[PDB]
Amino acid sequence: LNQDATILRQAKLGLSDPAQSLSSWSDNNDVTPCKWLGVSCDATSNVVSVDLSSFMLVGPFPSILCHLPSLHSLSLYNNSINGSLSADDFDTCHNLISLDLSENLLVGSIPKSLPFNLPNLKFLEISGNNLSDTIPSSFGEFRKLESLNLAGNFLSGTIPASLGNVTTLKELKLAYNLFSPSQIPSQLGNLTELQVLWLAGCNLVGPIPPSLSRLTSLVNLDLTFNQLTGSIPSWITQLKTVEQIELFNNSFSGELPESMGNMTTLKRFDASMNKLTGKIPDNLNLLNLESLNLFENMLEGPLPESITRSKTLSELKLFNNRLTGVLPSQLGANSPLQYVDLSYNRFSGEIPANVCGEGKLEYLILIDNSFSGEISNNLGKCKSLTRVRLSNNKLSGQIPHGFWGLPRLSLLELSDNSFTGSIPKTIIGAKNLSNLRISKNRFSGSIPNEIGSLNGIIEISGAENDFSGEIPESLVKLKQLSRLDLSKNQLSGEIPRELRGWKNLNELNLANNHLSGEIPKEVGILPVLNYLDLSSNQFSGEIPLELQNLKLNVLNLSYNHLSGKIPPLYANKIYAHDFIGNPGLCVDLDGLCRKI
Amino acid sequence: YVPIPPSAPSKRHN
Amino acid sequence: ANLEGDALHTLRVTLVDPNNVLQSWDPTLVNPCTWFHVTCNNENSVIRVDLGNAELSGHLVPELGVLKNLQYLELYSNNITGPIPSNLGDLTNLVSLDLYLNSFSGPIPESLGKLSKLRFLRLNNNSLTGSIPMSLTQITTLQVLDLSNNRLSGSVPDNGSFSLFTPISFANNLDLCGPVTSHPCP
Ligand SMILES: *[C@@H]1O[C@H](CO)[C@@H](O[C@@H]2O[C@H](CO)[C@@H](O)[C@H](O)[C@H]2NC(C)=O)[C@H](O)[C@H]1NC(C)=O
Ligand SMILES: *[C@@H]1O[C@H](CO)[C@@H](O[C@@H]2O[C@H](CO)[C@@H](O)[C@H](O)[C@H]2NC(C)=O)[C@H](O)[C@H]1NC(C)=O
Ligand SMILES: *[C@@H]1O[C@H](CO)[C@@H](O[C@@H]2O[C@H](CO)[C@@H](O)[C@H](O)[C@H]2NC(C)=O)[C@H](O)[C@H]1NC(C)=O
Ligand SMILES: *[C@@H]1O[C@H](CO)[C@@H](O[C@@H]2O[C@H](CO)[C@@H](O)[C@H](O)[C@H]2NC(C)=O)[C@H](O)[C@H]1NC(C)=O
Ligand SMILES: *[C@@H]1O[C@H](CO)[C@@H](O)[C@H](O)[C@H]1NC(C)=O
Ligand SMILES: *[C@@H]1O[C@H](CO)[C@@H](O)[C@H](O)[C@H]1NC(C)=O
Ligand SMILES: *[C@@H]1O[C@H](CO)[C@@H](O)[C@H](O)[C@H]1NC(C)=O
Ligand SMILES: *[C@@H]1O[C@H](CO)[C@@H](O)[C@H](O)[C@H]1NC(C)=O
């Protein structure tokens, strides 16, 4: 069926095909090339493109495929095409418009003669290969090229200035290459049709060139993971169609440009992990803003109210700054807030009452601020929450009952506040809860028995509270519990005798309570218990001999009412500080038992 | 297959 | 935080984890202090790694030595193979090294003598070979030692911290000699 059938089969001969992805090709039934897998034709039965994406093909680049006279697109995306490219590989390919060689095992240099050989190329991708040497300056001779992606190679030297000559470019992607330290070439400002500029991990230094103000039709500007310096220039405001700006992991300093507020097209802005100072610009009118990340800078002053005009805002991460004042009271009321992290700032006042106004809030992370007042009733209705961290604030009052029973809540960290009240029965609802952190509060009443029905709990940490009553017997039903710290409370009574359920319990800390009775013998058969603190209690009876089976790192039974002989392995001088303040304990020397 | 980090916002949090 | 989280993540990639005990070890977290099986001090620095009896296999990584405030390293009752990394001796605040009940091979590294605060050393039930490093006698704090059920050989030292240890610390080894064993040395 014509030379197209012949040429395709020769190309298949040169490649190893372990998955038999091309079994339609070399498997006859008189079928013509146009219905073979990956091969597409025009109306006159000429092979116009070949797409062999993700076929697990191994071997050198099949240059014979360009003997197809009508070939316009060639995609070998995501295979194991190996070896290097040469000038000879692209001699006959002068009709190609599109060439995708990305995600292969190509090594060596990009042939210098490529633009001369491929005059009609609009799309060139050789991303995610192992290419080395410099980007040829001959690439300035490309007359029609609209997209160039060489990202994720080991290309060296510097980004050639001659790429500014290729004014047909809409996308320039050179990210994650092994370039020498250098400034962004000034000539890239000539590329006035550029929509995408992705020079992340390109070892760039110095300021962003003023030339780049002329890139007025930019959609996505990503310069992440370099060492760029100076201010984030105020001419980013003049990018009329810009949707994404990614500047994180650089050495940018100075203020965010005050003119930023009127960038109505901006969806995603991230200048995190820089050295930014001054205030977040006010009078914001960011109608299309989905994501604002400015974390790990030295930003000061408030979060302006006008952030609430961004009604499509889902991500707001300002953590690790010097931000002060009250949050906008209406934040989250009329936007689909999803990820909020304002940790490690100096925010004061109330947590906004309708922060989960649209029922999308997953992360509420407010660590180490001065948030005062209470958690509102409306956060109890926020059934999308998975990660809540409110610790080290000035929060107080009772937690709403529905908040404890949130069905997807995984990490609940309320620690180091002044929360009051008892943990309610409604905590049965929290079926994904794996990490409960409520230490250093004023929680009271009994630990409710309903915590024991939450099979997936791994940590319970509620030290330094006013919990009273017994330890629920149902806490032993928790098979995956690895830490229990209920130390420094008013708990009373004894601990359950049947403990084999605690097969994962690594740490048990019940110190500084009013606990009584015997230390259960089954404590000695817990498979992974390495930290046992039962000190400052009223435990009586003998220290079980079964405790000798444990390989403890911390063992502390000090300040109890224990008596009788110390188990012989622990009578050794080296363990003596573990049993201080137990007058009735003795060291047996076979016959004589002495109180030491 | 070389996983090239996407052109997107940093996912760092806490 | 950043550096410690990256070390522990490098460990995760290198271990085999059929029961997904390292599910929570999310590398996008600022630090590993909310991760399961990890404990941090008040300054958000790792002080415990508790991964005993977790059906882990593969091998340990040398990047573990960046955990400068680590006090307790529990990796016992797994099926971990390969050598004990030499730069576990960089863990200057380590109190307990519990690698027992695994398939560790090769020597006990000489570098473990630089663990000046080590109290518990339990390496029993492995396939460790060679001799017991003398440098271990110079750990003044060392009070609990179990090297039993290994393939160790040569002289067992009995000075310094080793003066406290009975035959049960060294039982069922390949070819050990000295006062604490019944056999004097070759
Ligand atoms: C790259 O190619 C591989 C292999 O052809 C693709 O992986 C296969 O496709 C899906 C991916 O989830 C699975 O059902 C198969 O089991 C995968 N096979 C493997 C890993 O051998 C992969 O999808 C392709 N990647 C891209 C980004 O296109
Ligand atoms: C991205 O930026 C952050 C902050 O600028 C870097 O984190 C710092 O890294 C240095 C070591 O290079 C540490 O000494 C600091 O403790 C880190 N600072 C903070 C605030 O965490 C991070 O290394 C950068 N990442 C990359 C991949 O370059
Ligand atoms: C065993 O626990 C007790 C507390 O129950 C520890 O003694 C306390 O140590 C703190 C210092 O951290 C001091 O405030 C007091 O001297 C002790 N408190 C009380 C209430 O007596 C003791 O250090 C622990 N023992 C071991 C060996 O770790
Ligand atoms: C080209 O780069 C890839 C990925 O950067 C390399 O592939 C890895 O090689 C190492 C060492 O052999 C393996 O442990 C990995 O399993 C490989 N695959 C991946 C996806 O990382 C490859 O070795 C490089 N090839 C050449 C010729 O330089
Ligand atoms: C391509 O890969 C195979 C092994 O996967 C190898 O035998 C062959 O020599 C490679 N080609 C080149 C040019 O190195
Ligand atoms: C916004 O304001 C600045 C100066 O205040 C102006 O130069 C810029 O072009 C304006 N941009 C838009 C999009 O209105
Ligand atoms: C330790 O090794 C000995 C000898 O192989 C073996 O009999 C014993 O079962 C092992 N200990 C444990 C707890 O498995
Ligand atoms: C123990 O004895 C050996 C041999 O004399 C010596 O080299 C080592 O330093 C001694 N260590 C201590 C702590 O005494």
Author numbering:
A (entry chain A): 21 to 616
B (entry chain B): 56 to 69
C (entry chain C): 26 to 211
Sentences from the paper on this structure:
The LRR-RKs HAESA (greek: to adhere to) and HAESA-LIKE 2 (HSL2) redundantly control floral abscission. A receptor protein called HAESA is found on the surface of the cells that surround a future break point on the plant. When its time to shed an organ, a hormone called IDA instructs HAESA to trigger the shedding process. The peptide hormone IDA binds to the HAESA LRR ectodomain.
To understand in molecular terms how SERK1 contributes to high-affinity IDA recognition, we solved a 2.43 Å crystal structure of the ternary HAESA – IDA – SERK1 complex. HAESA LRRs 16–21 and its C-terminal capping domain undergo a conformational change upon SERK1 binding. The SERK1 ectodomain interacts with the IDA peptide binding site using a loop region (residues 51-59SERK1) from its N-terminal cap. SERK1 loop residues establish multiple hydrophobic and polar contacts with Lys66IDA and the C-terminal Arg-His-Asn motif in IDA. SERK1 LRRs 1–5 and its C-terminal capping domain form an additional zipper-like interface with residues originating from HAESA LRRs 15–21 and from the HAESA C-terminal cap. The four C-terminal residues in IDA (Lys66IDA-Asn69IDA) are conserved among IDA family members and are in direct contact with SERK1. We found that HAESA senses IDA with a ~60 fold higher binding affinity in the presence of SERK1, suggesting that SERK1 is involved in the specific recognition of the peptide hormone. In this case, there was no detectable interaction between receptor and co-receptor, while in the presence of IDA, SERK1 strongly binds HAESA with a dissociation constant in the mid-nanomolar range. In our quantitative biochemical assays, the presence of SERK1 dramatically increases the HAESA binding specificity and affinity for IDA. This observation is consistent with our complex structure in which receptor and co-receptor together form the IDA binding pocket. Comparison of our HAESA – IDA – SERK1 structure with the brassinosteroid receptor signaling complex, where SERK1 also acts as co-receptor, reveals an overall conserved mode of SERK1 binding, while the ligand binding pockets map to very different areas in the corresponding receptors (LRRs 2 – 14; HAESA; LRRs 21 – 25, BRI1) and may involve an island domain (BRI1) or not (HAESA).
